[PDB]
Design an enzyme around this catalytic site. Structure first.
Site, PDB file in Angstrom:
ATOM      1  CE  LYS A 114      66.969  12.510  43.967  1.00 33.24           C
ATOM      2  NZ  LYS A 114      67.176  13.971  43.900  1.00 33.24           N
TER       3      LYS A 114
ATOM      4  CB  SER B 172      73.839  16.629  41.357  1.00 31.63           C
ATOM      5  OG  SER B 172      73.270  17.805  41.926  1.00 31.63           O
TER       6      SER B 172
ATOM      7  CD  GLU C  90      62.901   7.182  49.125  1.00 31.80           C
ATOM      8  OE1 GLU C  90      62.632   5.987  48.893  1.00 31.80           O
ATOM      9  OE2 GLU C  90      64.016   7.666  48.853  1.00 31.80           O
TER      10      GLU C  90
HETATM   11  C1  PLP Z   1      67.915  14.615  44.832  1.00 30.45           C
HETATM   12  C2  PLP Z   1      69.058  15.550  44.351  1.00 30.45           C
HETATM   13  C3  PLP Z   1      70.202  15.708  45.099  1.00 30.45           C
HETATM   14  C4  PLP Z   1      70.271  15.197  46.573  1.00 30.45           C
HETATM   15  O1  PLP Z   1      70.445  13.750  46.756  1.00 30.45           O
HETATM   16  P1  PLP Z   1      71.764  13.098  46.884  1.00 30.45           P
HETATM   17  O2  PLP Z   1      71.344  11.707  47.216  1.00 30.45           O
HETATM   18  O3  PLP Z   1      72.476  13.675  48.029  1.00 30.45           O
HETATM   19  O4  PLP Z   1      72.598  13.172  45.673  1.00 30.45           O
HETATM   20  C5  PLP Z   1      71.245  16.410  44.588  1.00 30.45           C
HETATM   21  N1  PLP Z   1      71.164  16.994  43.358  1.00 30.45           N
HETATM   22  C6  PLP Z   1      70.017  16.867  42.620  1.00 30.45           C
HETATM   23  C7  PLP Z   1      69.884  17.613  41.246  1.00 30.45           C
HETATM   24  C8  PLP Z   1      68.973  16.141  43.118  1.00 30.45           C
HETATM   25  O5  PLP Z   1      67.808  15.994  42.346  1.00 30.45           O
END
Ligand code: PLP
Ligand code: IPL
Ligand code: IPL
Ligand code: PLP
Ligand code: NA
Ligand code: NA
Lengths: 392, 254, 392, 254
Positions: free
Chosen positions: C86, C376, C108
Site C-alpha cells: 500500500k 503483498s 478510508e
Molecule cells: C490491503 C491489502 C490487500 C488488499 O488490497 P488490494 O487493493 O487488493 O491489493 C492485499 N494485501 C495486503 C497485505 C493488504 O494490506
C-alpha cells in the site's frame, strides 16, 4: 591457543568451563575458514540480498532537522526481514553451523527478537532450532514466542536465577556444553566468549559498509558521527566497524539510562558498571558490590543484556568511541517524534540512538553536523508499551 | 599447608580412596549448612568441596542451581561464606577444603585479594568453574602465591596437550570429569591425584573410581538432593546425609 | 469529457454525484501532467527507493517446492516500509496532492493498513491527514488505529450503514465533495471512480516491473504465471500491469472464498457477485438480489472491499486474467507453511495468493512451472488471529 | 403524463412557488410513512421527492442516512417502496412524484425495466444521485422512453457547458443545489424549472428562492428531522409535519 586474538585490550577472552573450549575452538576455526571462502561469502551475500532485503535504505530526515544545521540520516535496519538488524548475523551463523555439519541450533533471547531471528534463519536453512528464554520474558513476549513456534522452533522457558536474559544465556551455554557436536549455539549479540564478539561484528559489518557507500553517494563525505544503541553491542559494532579507521568519524554508542543513572535503574554497564567476568568474557557488567550479576533495566526490552560487547569496552577505553546514555523518557520522546515527523515507527531500542542524535541537534542547533543513526529495528512491537505509558 | 598431600598419603597408606562430598555454603541456611557440613565430616568425608552461591552458575546442573537459590533466599553472601569457612576450619584442622567458585566472585575485588582471603580462612583449593586453562594464568599464579591449590577440570575428551597443561598447572587434586587413559596419562604427567566427579551417586561408583586408578570420588548433586528432599525435616535431613556419606565412604575402603 | 478512458470495457466509469466531477477531472488532469513530468517521476522514485525501500527482493522458495517441478518466487512487498504494498501508491498520491497545491489528505480504511499507509505518507510529506474507518473496524483494529494517531493522523469512526469499509468509503466521498479544493481523497485500492483505478495501477506498477527484471535476471525468462490476492485489486494490478502484453504470462487473481463460495460467506464478487454500480464505478459487487450492497467476508480483514477494481473485471472478461478463490482454511494452511518452511510470516491477504500457488504445485507436482506470488504484506498483524483459531 | 408541466403552469398562473418536501419511503415504517406523505400533501406540498432506502447513500447527509436506517430497520425494500408509490398515486392523481435514487437500484434488474416500473406506478421523475451528466445517457434515454423526467443536479459552481447539458438533458425540474446567474442561465438555455435545494429549512428561504427566480424549493432534512424528533409520538409527528409544511408552503405564495 587460538587463530585470532580473543581480547580487545583487557576485554573479552574465553571464560568458559573447560568442556566448552573445543566448541569455541572448532567455531573459530570454521569461521576463519568461512571468511576466506568465496563460496560462503557468496551464499551469505545471496541470502542477505534476496531473502533478507539488503541493502537497506539510508533515509534522510529533513522534517526532523528543519531549522537546524544538522543533517540526519537513518540507516534502515527496520526494513530488514524480521524488522531488526538481528537477521543479518543469524543468517551468517546458520550458514556457519551448516559449514560445520551441524543440524541443530541453540539460541537465547530476551525480548524475543533474537529468538525470532534464530527461528527464521533455522526454518530457511533446515536447521532444528531450540530457544531458551527466561520465563519472565516468555510471559511478557507471547507474540514473539508464538512467531518462534509458527516457524518451527522449540521455545524452552528458563526459570533459574532471575528468569530473564542472563539466565537464558547460562542455559544456552549449559546445553551446548553437551550438544556442540551436532548443535551450534547461535549467540545473539557481540558479546560472550571469543569468537562470538568477532563473528557477530563481522556478520553485522555490512550495516556500516553500506552506510559508508550510501553517505558518500548522497553527501560526498563521511558522517561527522554514527550513533547506535547498545544493548549487547551488535548493531552498534555492525555500524561502527567499517568506520573505525576513519578517524574523523565519531562513533557514539547509546546505552539505556532507564529511569536515570542516578536511580540505579538503568542498563548502562559500559559507563556505569564495573568490569567483571561472566558469560564467558571480561567486560563491564551490571553487578552488585559483591559480584552477583544483575539485570539491566530499560523501557526497551531489547536493551536488556546486563553487560556489553568487549570491543565496545575497548573502543571506549582508547577514546575511539564515546558512549552515552538516554533515559526511558528521552527514548519515548524520540519514538513519538519520528512517528509524527517521518512516518517511521522506530523500535524503542533504536529510539535511544535517535534520542541522542536529537539532543546533539537540539543542544547546538547552529552546529553543522552530518549524523547517521542506526535504526536498528521497527517499533510495531512497542506500540502497546507506548500506548499504555501515554495512557498512564 | 599441605592438607591434600597429607590426606592422599594417609589414604594411600591405607589403600583407600577419598570420598569428597560437595555442598553449597549456606544451603538451606547458614546454621543448617554448618550442621550439614559437620555431619558430612563425622560421617566420613575425607575432604570437602564447597560452593559459594553465585547468581549465574552456568556450569551447574539443576540440583546445584536450586541449592544456589535456596542459599540466596536465605541471604547468603560471599562474605558470610568466608565467615562459615573460618568456623569450619576452626573445628576441623586437617580436612582439605576446596571451594568451587565462579570467576566473577574471584575477580571482583581482586584476584590476589581473593586467594589471600582463602589462605587467611584456611581454604586449601579453589576450582574456578568458568576459567579454562587458557585463561588461568592470573588465577593459578595468585593461588600458588597464597598456598592455595588451583584445581582444574580434565574433561572427558581432553587431548594430550590439555592433559599436560592440567598436570602442570593444577595442584592438590585433578578434577576428572566423567577413562583409564585419562587416569594413566595424568599419572604419567605427574598430575595432582585424580578425584572423579559428575553424577557419582552410589557406592559402586566410588569403588569403581578407585579401581580405575582415581584417588577418590566427588559427589555433589546426590548430596544436595538429600538436602532438597528433607527441607521440611532438618533432623531427617542430617540422618539421611550421614547414612549416604557413610555408605559412600565405606565403598572407598580396601 | 476526460483525457483518459474511464472504462475498461463495460467496467469502471465515474458514477459520482455531479458536485464531485470537478474534483475527479482536476485529479485526472494533474495525474496526466505528473506522469509526463520527469521531476515528479524522480521525486516519486526517490521516496520509493530511499524511504520505502524499493526495490523489494524476489525470494526463491526452494523448501516449499522441494520434490516438485514448480519453482516459486515471492515478490517481497512484505519488506516494503509499512509492511505492505500500500505504501507505494500512497506516496504517489501524496505527491499528486502536493502537485495540486493541496495540504490535506482524506482516506478510508478497513483493516487499517491503508489508513496507516496514508498516515505515514502524510507525515512524511507534511500533509494534514484524516482517515475514515467504520466503527466495527475501529473496534477490531486498535493497533492500526493507534499507529495512525502516533503518525499525526485524525481517525474518524463511521457508524452509518454496516460501520465497515464500504461505509467509510461513502463518508470519504462525502467529505471530499465539500473539501476537494484543499484536500485530496487518497483512495486505497484500484477501484472507485476514474481516475483512481488508473492512478493506483500506475503507482503500483513497479511491483510487476521489478518482478519482470528480477525474474529475467534469475531465470532468464518470464514467469509461467504471476499470482496475487484480490481485495480491491491494487497489489494484483500492480503485479499484473507490466506483464499484460506478455501473452505467455498467466495472470491469476485470488479472491477470498471465506467459509466457501457455496456458503455465501465470501469476498469473491468478481467470480461470484453481480455487476452493479457503487462507489463510483460499474463493477462486480457483493450485493443482495434487491441491489443493496453487502460486506465481503474473509478471515483476512484486508480482503474486505465488497467489489473489485474494474480493470480486473475487464481482464477477466476477455480471458486475459483468470480469477479463482481460496478459502479461509486454505489461506491459513499457506500461512503456516510459509512460516515453517521459509521463515517468512505472510499477511493473511497474501496467504490467499500463496495458497493458490501451493494448489497449482500440489495438484500437478510433475508439471514444470515458474510461479511468482506477490507477497503483498507481512503477517505479524495476523499472529493473534491465527493463534486464536489454532487454539480454538 | 405532464404532471410537472401542469403543476408549474398552475403555480405560475398564481405567481406562486412550489414547495416540495422530501421523505424516505418507509421511514419509520410503511404505515406511518404513508400517513406522513398524506399529511405532507394535505398540508400543502405541491410535489413530492421520495427516497428509496439504499445501503450506501453516499450523496446523503446524516439526517437522511438515519432515515434510510430506520426504513431498513422496518424491513423496507424497493419492492415495498413501489407498492407504496402505487397506493400514493392512487390517492393523489395529479401531484408530481419524483424519486431520489441511487444508481445501483436503477441498474440492478435493468435500467429500462426500472423506468418501466416507475411509469407503471405513476412516478413522474427520477433523480439518480450518483449519475453525473457524463454517465447519464442510458438513464435519461430510458426515462424519456417511459415518460419519466430525468432530473439533474446543477451544482453550486457548474460551468457553462454543464448548465447547457443540464438544460438539455433534464425534464420536469432542475435540481438547483445551493445563484442568480445559475438561475438566469438555466432559463436562458430553456432548462426545466429550477427547484432550489440543500438546507432549505425555513419559510424565509422558500420566499427567497422564489424571489431569486427559482420555481420553488425542496426541503428534506428539515422534514426528516421532524420524523426523527417525534418517533415516540406518531400523532405529534404528523401535527408537527403539518405545521411545518403549511408554513413553508405559505411562504411560496404571492
Ligand atoms: C490491503 C491489502 C490487500 C488488499 O488490497 P488490494 O487493493 O487488493 O491489493 C492485499 N494485501 C495486503 C497485505 C493488504 O494490506
Ligand atoms: O555430583 P555432581 O555431578 O553434581 O558433581 C559435583 C561436583 C562439584 C561441583 C559443583 N558445581 C560444579 C561446577 C563445575 C565443576 C564441579 C562442580
Ligand atoms: O433539505 P436537504 O438539504 O436535505 O435537501 C434534500 C433534497 C432531496 C434529497 C435527498 N437525498 C438526496 C441526494 C442528492 C440530491 C438530493 C437529495
Ligand atoms: C536486540 C536489539 C537491539 C540490542 O542488541 P544489540 O546487540 O546491542 O544490537 C537493538 N535494536 C533492536 C531493534 C534489537 O532488536
Ligand atoms: Na548492556
Ligand atoms: Na473484493
Amino acid at each position: 591457543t587460538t587463530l585470532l586474538n580473543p581480547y580487545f585490550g583487557e576485554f573479552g577472552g574465553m571464560y568458559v568451563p573447560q568442556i566448552l573450549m573445543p566448541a569455541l575452538n572448532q567455531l573459530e576455526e570454521a569461521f576463519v575458514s568461512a571468511q576466506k571462502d568465496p563460496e560462503f561469502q557468496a551464499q551469505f551475500a545471496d541470502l542477505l540480498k534476496n531473502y533478507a532485503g539488503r541493502p537497506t535504505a539510508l533515509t534522510k530526515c529533513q522534517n526532523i532537522t528543519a531549522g537546524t544545521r544538522t543533517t540526519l540520516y537513518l540507516k534502515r535496519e527496520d526494513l530488514l526481514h524480521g524488522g531488526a538488524h538481528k537477521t543479518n548475523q543469524v543468517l551468517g551463523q546458520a550458514l556457519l553451523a551448516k559449514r560445520m555439519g551441524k543440524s541443530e541450533i541453540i539460541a537465547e533471547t530476551g525480548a524475543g527478537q533474537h529468538g525470532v531471528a534464530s527461528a527464521l534463519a533455522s526454518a530457511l536453512l533446515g536447521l532444528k532450532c531450540r530457544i531458551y528464554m527466561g520465563a519472565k520474558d516468555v510471559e511478557r513476549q507471547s507474540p514473539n514466542v508464538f512467531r518462534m513456534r509458527l516457524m518451527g522452533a522449540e521455545v524452552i522457558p528458563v526459570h533459574s536465577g532471575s528468569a530473564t536474559l542472563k539466565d537464558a544465556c547460562n542455559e544456552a551455554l549449559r546445553d551446548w556444553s553437551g550438544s556442540y557436536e551436532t548443535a551450534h549455539y547461535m549467540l545473539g549479540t557481540a558479546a560472550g566468549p571469543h569468537p562470538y564478539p568477532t563473528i557477530v561484528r563481522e556478520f553485522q559489518r555490512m550495516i556500516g559498509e553500506e552506510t559508508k557507500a550510501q553517505i558518500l553517494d548522497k553527501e560526498g563525505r563521511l558522517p561527522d558521527a554514527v550513533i547506535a544503541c547498545v544493548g549487547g553491542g551488535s548493531n552498534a559494532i555492525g555500524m561502527f566497524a567499517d568506520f573505525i579507521n576513519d578517524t574523523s568519524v565519531g562513533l557514539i554508542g547509546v546505552e539505556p539510562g532507564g529511569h536515570g543513572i542516578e536511580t540505579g535503574e538503568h542498563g548502562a554497564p559500559l559507563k556505569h558498571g564495573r568490569v567483571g567476568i561472566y558469560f564467558g568474557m571480561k567486560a563491564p557488567m551490571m553487578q552488585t558490590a559483591d559480584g552477583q550479576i544483575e539485570e539491566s533495566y530499560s523501557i526497551s526490552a531489547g536493551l536488556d543484556f546486563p553487560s556489553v560487547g568487549p570491543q565496545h569496552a575497548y573502543l571506549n577505553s582508547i577514546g575511539r568511541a564515546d558512549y552515552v546514555s538516554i533515559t526511558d523518557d528521552e527514548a519515548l520522546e524520540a519514538f513519538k517524534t519520528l512517528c509524527r515527523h517521518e512516518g517511521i515507527i522506530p523500535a524503542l531500542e533504536s529510539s535511544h540512538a535517535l534520542a541522542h542524535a536529537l539532543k546533539m541537534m537540539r543542544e547546538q542547533p547552529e552546529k553543522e553536523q552530518l549524523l547517521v543513526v542506526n535504526l536498528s529495528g521497527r517499533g510495531d512491537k512497542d506500540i502497546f508499551t507506548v500506548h499504555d505509558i501515554l495512557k498512564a | 599447608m599441605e592438607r591434600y598431600e597429607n590426606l592422599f598419603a594417609q589414604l594411600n597408606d591405607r589403600r583407600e580412596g577419598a570420598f569428597v562430598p560437595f555442598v553449597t555454603l549456606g544451603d538451606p541456611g547458614i546454621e543448617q549448612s554448618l550442621k550439614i557440613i559437620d555431619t558430612l565430616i563425622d560421617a566420613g568425608a575425607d575432604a570437602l568441596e564447597l560452593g559459594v552461591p553465585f547468581s549465574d552458575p552456568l556450569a551447574d546442573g539443576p540440583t546445584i542451581q536450586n541449592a544456589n537459590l535456596r542459599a540466596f533466599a536465605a541471604g547468603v553472601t560471599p562474605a558470610q561464606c568466608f565467615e562459615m569457612l573460618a568456623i569450619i576450619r576452626e573445628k576441623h584442622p586437617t580436612i582439605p577444603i576446596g571451594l568451587l567458585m565462579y570467576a566473577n566472585l574471584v575477580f571482583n575485588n581482586g584476584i590476589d585479594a581473593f586467594y589471600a582471603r582463602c589462605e587467611q580462612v584456611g581454604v586449601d583449593s579453589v576450582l574456578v568453574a568458568d576459567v579454562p586453562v587458557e585463561e588461568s594464568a592470573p588465577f593459578r599464579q595468585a593461588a600458588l602465591r597464597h598456598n592455595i591449590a588451583p584445581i582444574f577440570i580434565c574433561p572427558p575428551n581432553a587431548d594430550d596437550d590439555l592433559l599436560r597443561q592440567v598436570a602442570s598447572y593444577g595442584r592438590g587434586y585433578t578434577y576428572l570429569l566423567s577413562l583409564h587413559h585419562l587416569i594413566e596419562k595424568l599419572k604419567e604427567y605427574h598430575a595432582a591425584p585424580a578425584l572423579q566427579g559428575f553424577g557419582i551417586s552410589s557406592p559402586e561408583q566410588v569403588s569403581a573410581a578407585v579401581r580405575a586408578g582415581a584417588a577418590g570420588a566427588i559427589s555433589g548433586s546426590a548430596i544436595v538432593k538429600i538436602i532438597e528432599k528433607n527441607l521440611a525435616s532438618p533432623k531427617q535431613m542430617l540422618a539421611e546425609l550421614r547414612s549416604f556419606v557413610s555408605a559412600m565412604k565405606a565403598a572407598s575402603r580396601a
